[PDB]
Amino acid sequence: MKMNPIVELFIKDFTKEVMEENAAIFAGAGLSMSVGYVSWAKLLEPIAQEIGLDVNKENDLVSLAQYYCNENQGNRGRINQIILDEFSRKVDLTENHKILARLPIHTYWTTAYDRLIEKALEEENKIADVKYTVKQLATTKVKRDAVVYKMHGDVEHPSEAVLIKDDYEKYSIKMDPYIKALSGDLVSKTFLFVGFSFTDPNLDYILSRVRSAYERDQRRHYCLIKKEERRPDELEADFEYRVRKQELFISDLSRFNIKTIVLNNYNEITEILQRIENNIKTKTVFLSGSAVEYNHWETEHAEQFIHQLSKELIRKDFNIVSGFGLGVGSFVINGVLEELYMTIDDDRLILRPFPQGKKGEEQWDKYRRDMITRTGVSIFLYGNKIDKGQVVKAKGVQSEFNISFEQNNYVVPVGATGYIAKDLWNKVNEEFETYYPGADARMKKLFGELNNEALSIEELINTIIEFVEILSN
Amino acid sequence: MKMNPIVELFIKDFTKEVMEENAAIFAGAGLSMSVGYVSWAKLLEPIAQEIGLDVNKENDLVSLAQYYCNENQGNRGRINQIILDEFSRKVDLTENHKILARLPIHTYWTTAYDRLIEKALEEENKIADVKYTVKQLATTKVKRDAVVYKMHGDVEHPSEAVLIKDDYEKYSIKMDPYIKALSGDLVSKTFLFVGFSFTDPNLDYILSRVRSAYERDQRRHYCLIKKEERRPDELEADFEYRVRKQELFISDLSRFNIKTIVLNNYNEITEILQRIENNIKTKTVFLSGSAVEYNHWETEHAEQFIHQLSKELIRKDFNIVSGFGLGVGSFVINGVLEELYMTIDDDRLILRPFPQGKKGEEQWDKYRRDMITRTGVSIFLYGNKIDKGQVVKAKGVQSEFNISFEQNNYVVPVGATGYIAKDLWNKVNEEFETYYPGADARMKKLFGELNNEALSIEELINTIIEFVEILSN
């Protein structure tokens, strides 16, 4: 289904930002607390007991750690050992980290010591450049896909982690290049603050400096904060007081032009990220098909149909990936060229002709999987081919359909074209929840109109375009 | 009972360190002064009289011995003879040495010339590798269980013992490998300084070097020092001055990140060590039982009970040792596997099936004693077996109970299961101080709830788990 209109507007804006590679993610400690790591308060629980305090009655953990260091003549051995033993455990990644790794985001700023972001980026075969030291800023990893600025330290270097109040006090001098880099990113990139509480003194100082430098012309940043929920045993008045206090905090965040999105549940973050990826993943379509006969239409009429379909798809800011199949590939190229020339960007039209010969047939399967992996939505037209002097049904269209379905791609079999596409349409229609879960009345009507053979070229193309649009957004 | 919260926190931390085999013991001369050896001042009393001085009016015994050597043109014959005659006597070990030998500690550093630590380690059938010479460091005894670095010399080699000031002055050159080894251990292992005064120049030099090398990132070490007590004839003001001076000394110790635990009595050291061993000894439980009938519950319900009990025990970081008894062993295995697979560590589940046949029955007794010796807590379920076509009471459960009781293991007879376990529960209940000395109201309530047959599976399992928890800690 869908979400609140505010969340939908945020999704549209951030998908617009990400596709231009001008988006950054600021991940706090809260993004990793769902993985399985104990909260920092629970880590400091024995430490507070040692100096005679209690974490449950303490609001400032930084001052708690500073008191612990003061008792031990400024020694951090126990704190370093605690953070090293806790944040270096072997835990499975959450879905949020994998989604963020799949997104085309080239900048991560983290206040968490764990390497979950690095691991998520490396699992997706993405070269990630982690920077948590001043000297590391002067060297850039070659062909990096994303840079993770760990602005508070790494788990493998506990002595450098910003935990106590002296660390924050000397941060402005020791880690000044990181402050300058974050100040530059907060004005040159659009941030999405996920799992961040906005209570960090370093972030307060940096944001205040940015606001003082730019006043009302600050760049718009987005934030995700869960609304306060009533505790199991609490009066109504205190819950309303907490909600009022959270509303004031959210309004105060927008002083730095950081728009806050209220989230009912923590699991809504994953649903937002999935939507953001889907609006990007489905932006590329895969025009599958091959035809020597064109069913009810004549060859010229169907060629015009395919040409105009590709022209409309390109006109609506879609990316066409075509295998240059016999009978549809040339007309797809013609439509794309007619729309574009009214040079060719490598992102608009992607041609992958299949090598002809017994040597290329062995690599055909991986070639086809590589093609389909580039796309998010698959559209199937006709699907017959001439074999043994007869118009047989082309099994490559079925193979593409199977590969796209294995990849959880949205399949749109145009049944009006006929042949193997009609069979695909019937197969999808028999079990509609399997291929299109949670569909609406409009989606079902459009799908049932895909097999309406009495439609003209324009009506069928409009049906397909509306179907792809409601799929993408 | 219990002790101060500071001591309890130290006990928890050090038990955590020992179970990971990252703990070391630094034993000074004070740990042996309880055995029966005369103090070093009393040994030097005739020597001081010889050169015209008096030990009671002298604070530095090292300089006293150096003066004695200076008078005799640098000859140490009398001092060597004195230390050889005093520290080679035949004395009985204290409880502290035996407890330290029973603990899983692989490193001992000693400034005492006596071989009490070696003897304690050898009494427990532990291969101990004593090192007091530079050449001995290059050779490691095969399959050693603990290495004792006698950093000041052995009693059987009085000429090499560090007694006079020239020995300390040339220690940095002669015994440099020992200094390097102690510097490595002070940063790679957690030390417990027992019976040490922290006035040794070698230790001061080594600790200062470690602090200069690591500054505030030094590893946390623990110390045990008795609080100053008022002498029989002393003013209040001088006693308060001594206490203030001791507090300043304790605070100065933490400059090297050595946390000091204030002990009211010397005998509290034994009570701390017993607690440290008990938190380790009781970490392993022995699930005893055998069932062909399952009392009030059905066979499936009781199988689920045993399965979930084992799953909860493993989930709470306990080690299950099972004799694979008929009716409980398979379900214990099922629970352990379900918890672990959500490979098998050799420490989590230990299976010792009893060999069936007249040849194995003769070794059954030693086999059972070996099994129970591995554990610290014994839990008994049901205990009937099919014999002569009838459900007789199984005497093996009673034998296990007797063996565990002979070993001072905590016995937890689950009386709700019934049969021989109900008899065991009644036997423990009749004389409760015999099996559970110094019990509290909560422990008595939990024990009386073990026979509450109206409890469900979850309630009974929670009762058993809480009982085992309050036993372990």
Next chain:
Amino acid sequence: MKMNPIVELFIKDFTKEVMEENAAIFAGAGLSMSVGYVSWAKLLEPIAQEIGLDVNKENDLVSLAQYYCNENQGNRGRINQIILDEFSRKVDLTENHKILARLPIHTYWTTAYDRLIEKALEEENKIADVKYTVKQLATTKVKRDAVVYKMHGDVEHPSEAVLIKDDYEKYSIKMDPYIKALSGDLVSKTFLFVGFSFTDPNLDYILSRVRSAYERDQRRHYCLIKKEERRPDELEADFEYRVRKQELFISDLSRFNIKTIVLNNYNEITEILQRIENNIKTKTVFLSGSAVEYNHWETEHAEQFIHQLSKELIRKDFNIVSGFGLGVGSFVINGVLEELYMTIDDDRLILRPFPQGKKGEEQWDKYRRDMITRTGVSIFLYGNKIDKGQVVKAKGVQSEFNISFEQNNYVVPVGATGYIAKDLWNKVNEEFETYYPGADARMKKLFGELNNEALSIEELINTIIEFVEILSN
């Protein structure tokens, strides 16, 4: 087959050292040059060209880098960028790294900046603690399986890497704790220097210090160096001069008691490591079988046979892992107990009784795979079981055989026992190269004697023992 007697003696000694966890690996840059990284000379080739020099005509690359830094007023930007871009590439691990990760080795010392060792250790699900900074020495990762001391720096921190001569000059002051740690390890552990040239000034200084401290009582260390091979265009006399110079260098290495093993090829390193692992992997046997009938022998005679076989296996320092199968498990336990009691070590006898019940049968497969994974050699006896009132063939023995074969374990089906073991023996005999590649005449004779049903108990046990011995070594 086998190798030179010197290499065999080294293999025996080092396998003896590794099994006692007293062995360490010192890996130089040469161990990674087979992975695909370009040599350090090729990295410095543009740098030398920049300052007017040439690497091919230069023997000291450290001085070359120092000259490059001197030209640029002591700036290392280009060198840091070069090492970061080269040693952070994504390359596949070699077999040597995987073998070293599988070995029970708890200490690695590396002069290579790449993280290949860390990756190899993490692929085997081993917790590895990488240390390349002074502060990192004071913190130990909990439950680490191996510690990798990167004594020259990490690739992700190029500014700290020891590349130029100033770095070596200030190493003795900056990285002094690493020098002390390596000095301690060079006297407390047996090292295997793989892929190291022994031209590093730091290693020369450390080894000279160790020799000066211990003189002729230094611990024995092992090294692997490839013999010099004639270049494609070179005179005989210069090749003989190079060989003489290498022999002198090898002899000079033994001054520090570092025995050097001459290797004809680089690929002989993998063959040595495979032998070292095989002598450790095959030290544990898996006694598979289940019997209600005992073929030609009577029940008592076959029970004595199994008992004595287990007793002999334990007597020859083997580890027995038994699934407590019906008919062989009890007698295996009896034999092991009789041999050991003449406590039970967790490594000598490992019992894994199979949970009986429909709940445990679902986990039986993973349980059996976990059991067999612990072992290196599988021995199969009988293999029948009572089903439907008849002595059917037990399929669990066949399943174990299949699992062991999938794991490349040596299978020893005792065909004299009969039943499913005779079928296993015939199956192995039909295609002998598949299960025992590169066998000798003695191995074939022993295998053909395993089915000699006329053998007595002692003769059959001796045959099995000799077979397992020639397999292990």
